[PDB]
């Protein structure tokens, strides 16, 4: 298991514009297109992203390409972030995958807002971090995906994904 297979399980794959759990226009492997209600505002962002007239549909390859860009940006954002970087650097390889997953889903800004849990992760207080992570809108809104990520942080294994 690696970050790519992990996120591919969490986000699924869809070749047609779809609405995410929050109701935003998405495509591929969890690639947010726009928070705008407009399906046209979304088709346009889509064309801009792919560099062709897609008419709301892309191929597997195109989805994978977006996905490679997104994981890369996720990692690079963590590394450029003063609050996130030190957490990441402190962690083992499995747990770094968990942090990257949260960033991919909620953006750097969002994750940086889990100040208390980040401090616990940094101190390697696993059980306490898992409890604090659960007190969040994130866990209440997407409990199954949250539990997987949280178990990954508590255990440092890929069991939740096995
Ligand atoms: Cl893009
Ligand atoms: Cl869920």
Curated annotation (Swiss-Prot):
Disulfide bridges in this chain: none
Effect ascribed to mutating residue 26 to E: Complete loss of activity at neutral pH; covalently bound substrate
UniProt-reported outcome of changing residue 20 to C: Nearly no effet on specific enzymatic activity
Activity response to pH changes: Optimum pH is 7.3.
Impact upon substituting residue 11 to A/F/H/M/N: Complete loss of enzymatic activity
Any one GO molecular-function label of the UniProt entry: lysozyme activity
Catalytic activity, reaction form: Hydrolysis of (1->4)-beta-linkages between N-acetylmuramic acid and N-acetyl-D-glucosamine residues in a peptidoglycan and between N-acetyl-D-glucosamine residues in chitodextrins
Example of a GO cellular component annotation carried by this entry: host cell cytoplasm
Principal location listed in the UniProt entry: host cell
Annotated phenotype, changing residue 117 to I: 500-fold decrease in enzymatic activity
Active-site annotation: 11, 20
GO biological process: cell wall macromolecule catabolic process; defense response to bacterium; peptidoglycan catabolic process; viral release from host cell by cytolysis
Source taxon at top rank: Viruses
Keywords carried by this UniProt record: Antimicrobial, Bacteriolytic enzyme, Cytolysis, Glycosidase, Host cell lysis by virus, Host cytoplasm, Hydrolase, Viral release from host cell
The protein's name: Endolysin
Organism in which the protein naturally occurs: Enterobacteria phage T4 (Bacteriophage T4)
Lineage: Viruses, Duplodnaviria, Heunggongvirae, Uroviricota, Caudoviricetes
